[PDB]
Amino acid sequence: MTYSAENTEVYITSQQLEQAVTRLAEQINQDYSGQQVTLVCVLKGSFMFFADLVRKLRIDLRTQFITASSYSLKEEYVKDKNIIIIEDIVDTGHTYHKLIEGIGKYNPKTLKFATLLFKPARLERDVKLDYVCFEIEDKFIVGYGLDFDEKYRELPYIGLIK
């Protein structure tokens, strides 16, 4: 019974992930200077990214958690709030338009989508991603909270399966 990293190759390093999350936090801090934002974590895969991001935010903040299959967030938490959805990966954009439809129906003041990883191949249609840490090639990736069969979430880096 061996550590899961030996089955993987580094694709994006943990230091590279730390610099992108810093960049993203500086950006959110600036765009929402003196305002309040509700950050929405899309479980399960965004949890590690979310844990690292929220610690570098310096604005008034509320945090909420949902899953993709929950489209569920209450109207009281959406109506007239600034929402930012925090996702691990956008591939087709099927999940995206479902989160932007099911939340946008309770009329937030603003609604933005951030993803750690974006895979532009097989994109459904027109998707507005307000924040992207990494635009990656069309590859099966694990680590930094993203799993395969409940393995690899624990890796501090984004990896390929050998």
What residues act catalytically?
Answer: 91
- Chain mean position to CA 100: 14
CA–CA dist 84, 32 (Å, integer): 11
- For residue 123, the minimal CB distance to Zn ion (Å) is 10
Pick from 60, 101, 124, 135 the residue near a second copy by CB under 8 A.
60
Pair type for strands 141-142 and 110-118: unpaired
Residue 88 in contact with Zn ion, rule: CB under 5 A: yes
Residue 52 in contact with Zn ion, rule: CB under 5 A: no
- For residue 70, the minimal CB distance to a second copy (Å) is 11
Pick from 4, 71, 94, 130 the residue near Zn ion by CB under 5 A.
94
Pick from 11, 16, 31, 64 the residue near a second copy by CB under 8 A.
64
58 interacts with, out of a second copy, Zn ion, none, CB within 5 to 8 A per kind: a second copy
Per-residue burial over 113-139, b if 16 or more Cβ lie within 10 Å, else e, is: bbbbbbbeeeeeeebeeebbbbebeee
Reading the block at residue 81, the tokens are: 């709030």
